[PDB]
């Protein structure tokens, strides 16, 4: 026997469904879900980190001319200066007082620290989904886990469950993301080979194990100071250090729909969007014929109290006479009222109690116990508590859901105006007809 | 202020708080006509004015 239902994607709220087949006793199931996870697919473009500058000892040639050649190293620079006269602690270094030169050079390499402190840029693609579900079945609590699509089934106590697919394709991630030690940011990083001297991406590498490094920092050599041996230079500061101090809030705090983020692997959980279909397959051996089940023949209903608050603020008493000892299922026949109990124990001639919640100002509903029905009605009052720490257990109301007193007043006013229009119309018709015919 | 969908608040290194509104009125859905209008106005201000 196949059964299909749809449950909204609301974590922490139980729902109930009724399954029956003619000739056999009905069953009521209760379901509640605990977690939903989405997982994207990632691809790596490049990583960034800090840079190091290497400067060897300078070469000084007095009363001769120095020269240098080009090299293939990144950001290589070379210059020759004239007119130097260096000193040391013991006196002037070389005999010649004129026509001296100095040679300076430098280049840029990748820092050793890049093995621990780095950031990576990813491209995102279509995500998968999974869910964890709790089921109350025949008085026992069981748990299942499955993929949120039609390609997986789980069997527990000789019953099969299939979940999914999801009704919505909304995903909190953009096409370009950046990940750093647990934080995920949305950022349109520049393409490889097109960096800027003082921004994110000034140094780029394909992978921590690569030898080929790109950089576009500024590096200019300057003239040395009189009497001093040194190599002054001007260089733009590292962009990576600046980003860390100005990066702002991550998606964990700004994302909509209450989503939460994890990074190992990248995931998003508990996003309150859409609904999830479920299909169940129950074997024939689980059903009992109505000739063996107990029956109830005479019932009536009274409702001594109702407050239409977010919690179970209603109570009802039902009278019954039962044919023999056994159990019955209880289910509501309306959408505006939810009943907490799943089953009852019945014996002899007695009464049972149930509780319910509703948003209606005036409530009418039917209740079914062991395949027979009663009618209940009552008026409800408002609560006085402004704020609570939990979501409501009931649905919203529509435009037609108004009190009986309001409806009565509407009919009286509309009828009065309609009557006066009809009378005026009748007067005109007789006058117009007679004048036509009299001529 | 607390909207219908609820508010989330975090302070320091502690855990977040969550709040939801609940219905409350000073009027009533039963009795005199002018008391009925107040009941609905306090719950759905925009729709009440337009319909009337
Ligand atoms: C721990 O160190 C390894 C390399 O030494 C690095 O790959 C990893 O990201 C570090 N873990 C954390 C949490 O910083
Ligand atoms: C386990 O089943 C009992 C009824 O037998 C129920 O009261 C209880 O809430 C269930 N456990 C959970 C975690 O809901
Ligand atoms: C109702 O009247 C009380 C009087 O104390 C006031 O505090 C409250 O704001 C009024 N409105 C509601 C919705 O309770």
From Swiss-Prot, chain A:
The name this protein goes by in its record: Spike glycoprotein E1
Post-translational modification: N-glycosylated.
Region feature (E1 fusion peptide loop): 84-101
Lipidation feature positions (S-stearoyl cysteine): 433
Disulfide bond entries: 49-114, 62-94, 63-96, 68-78, 259-271, 301-376, 306-380, 328-370
Bilayer-spanning residue ranges: 416-436
Stretches assigned to the Extracellular side: 8-415
Oligomer and partners: Interacts with spike glycoprotein E2. The precursor of protein E3/E2 and E1 form a heterodimer shortly after synthesis. Processing of the precursor of protein E3/E2 into E2 and E3 results in a heterodimer of the spike glycoproteins E2 and E1. Spike at virion surface are constituted of three E2-E1 heterodimers. After target cell attachment and endocytosis, E1 change conformation to form homotrimers. Interacts with 6K protein. Interacts with host MXRA8; this interaction mediates virus entry. The interaction involves 2 adjacent E2-E1 heterodimers.
UniProt-annotated location(s): Virion membrane; Host cell membrane
Function field: Class II viral fusion protein. Fusion activity is inactive as long as E1 is bound to E2 in mature virion. After virus attachment to target cell via host MXRA8 and endocytosis, acidification of the endosome induce dissociation of E1/E2 heterodimer and concomitant trimerization of the E1 subunits. This E1 trimer is fusion active, and promotes release of viral nucleocapsid in cytoplasm after endosome and viral membrane fusion. Efficient fusion requires the presence of cholesterol and sphingolipid in the target membrane.
Glycosylation sites: 141, 270
Lipid-anchored residues (S-palmitoyl cysteine): 433
Cytoplasmic side: 437-439
Record membrane topology: Single-pass type I membrane protein
Curated annotation (Swiss-Prot), chain B:
Highest taxon listed in the record's lineage: Viruses
PTM field: Palmitoylated via thioester bonds. These palmitoylations may induce disruption of the C-terminus transmembrane. This would result in the reorientation of E2 C-terminus from lumenal to cytoplasmic side. N-glycosylated.
Known glycosylation sites: 26
Subcellular location: Virion membrane; Host cell membrane
Job description of the protein: Plays a role in viral attachment to target host cell, by binding to the cell receptor MXRA8. Synthesized as a p62 precursor which is processed by furin at the cell membrane just before virion budding, giving rise to E2-E1 heterodimer. The p62-E1 heterodimer is stable, whereas E2-E1 is unstable and dissociate at low pH. p62 is processed at the last step, presumably to avoid E1 fusion activation before its final export to cell surface.
Subunit structure: Interacts with spike glycoprotein E1. Processing of the precursor of protein E3/E2 into E2 and E3 results in a heterodimer of the spike glycoproteins E2 and E1. Spike at virion surface are constituted of a trimer of E2-E1 heterodimers. Interacts with 6K protein. Interacts with host MXRA8; this interaction mediates virus entry. The interaction involves 2 adjacent E2-E1 heterodimers.
Protein name per its UniProtKB record: Spike glycoprotein E2
Lineage: Viruses, Riboviria, Orthornavirae, Kitrinoviricota, Alsuviricetes
């Amino acid at each position: 026997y196949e059964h299909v239902t749809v449950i909204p994607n609301t974590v922490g709220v139980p729902y109930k469904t009724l399954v029956n087949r003619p000739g056999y006793s009905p069953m009521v199931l209760e379901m509640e879900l605990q977690s939903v996870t989405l997982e994207p697919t990632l691809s790596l473009d490049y990583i960034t980190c800090e840079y190091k500058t290497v400067i060897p000892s300078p070469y000084v040639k007095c009363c001769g001319t120095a020269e240098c050649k080009d090299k293939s190293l990144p950001d290589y620079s070379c210059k020759v200066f004239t007119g130097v006269y260096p000193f040391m602690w013991g006196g002037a270094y070389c005999f010649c007082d004129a026509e001296n030169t100095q040679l300076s050079e430098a280049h840029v390499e990748k820092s050793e620290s890049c093995k621990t402190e780095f950031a990576s840029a990813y491209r995102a693609h279509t995500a998968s989904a999974s869910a964890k579900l709790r089921v109350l079945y025949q008085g026992n609590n069981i748990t299942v886990a499955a993929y949120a699509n039609g390609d997986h089934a789980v069997t527990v106590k000789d019953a099969k469950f299939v979940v999914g697919p999801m009704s919505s394709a909304w995903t909190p991630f953009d096409n370009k993301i950046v990940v750093y030690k647990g934080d995920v940011y949305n950022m349109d990083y520049p393409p490889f080979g097109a960096g800027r001297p003082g921004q994110f991406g000034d140094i780029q590498s394909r992978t921590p194990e690569s030898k080929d490094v790109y950089a576009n920092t500024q590096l200019v050599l300057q003239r040395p100071a009189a009497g001093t041996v040194h190599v002054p230079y001007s260089q733009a500061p590292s962009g990576f250090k600046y980003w860390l101090k100005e990066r702002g809030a991550s998606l964990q705090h700004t994302a909509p729909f209450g989503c939460q983020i994890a990074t190992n692997p990248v995931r998003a959980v508990n996003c309150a969007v859409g609904n999830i279909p479920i299909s169940i397959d129950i074997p024939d051996a689980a059903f009992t014929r109505v000739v063996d089940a107990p029956s109830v023949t005479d019932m009536s209903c009274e409702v001594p109290a109702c407050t239409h608050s977010s919690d179970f603020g209603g109570v009802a008493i039902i009278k019954y006479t039962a044919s023999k000892k056994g159990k019955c299922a209880v289910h509501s026949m309306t959408n505006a009222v939810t009943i907490r109990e799943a089953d009852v124990e019945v014996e002899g001639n007695s009464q049972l109690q149930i509780s319910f919640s509703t948003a209606l100002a005036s409530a009418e509903f039917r209740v079914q116990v062991c395949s027979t029905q009663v009618h209940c009605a009552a008026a409800c009052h408002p609560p006085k508590d402004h704020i609570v720490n939990y979501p409501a257990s009931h649905t919203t109301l529509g435009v037609q859901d108004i009190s009986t007193t309001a409806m009565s007043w509407v009919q009286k006013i509309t009828g009065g105006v309609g009557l006066i229009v009809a009378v005026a119309a009748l007067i005109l018709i007789v006058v117009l007809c007679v004048s036509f015919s009299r001529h | 202020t607390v909207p219908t969908e609820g508010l989330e608040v975090t302070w320091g290194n502690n855990e977040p708080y969550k709040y939801w509104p609940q219905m409350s009125t000073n009027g009533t859905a039963h009795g005199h006509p002018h008391e009925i209008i107040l009941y609905y106005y306090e719950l759905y201000p925009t729709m009440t004015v337009v319909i009337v």
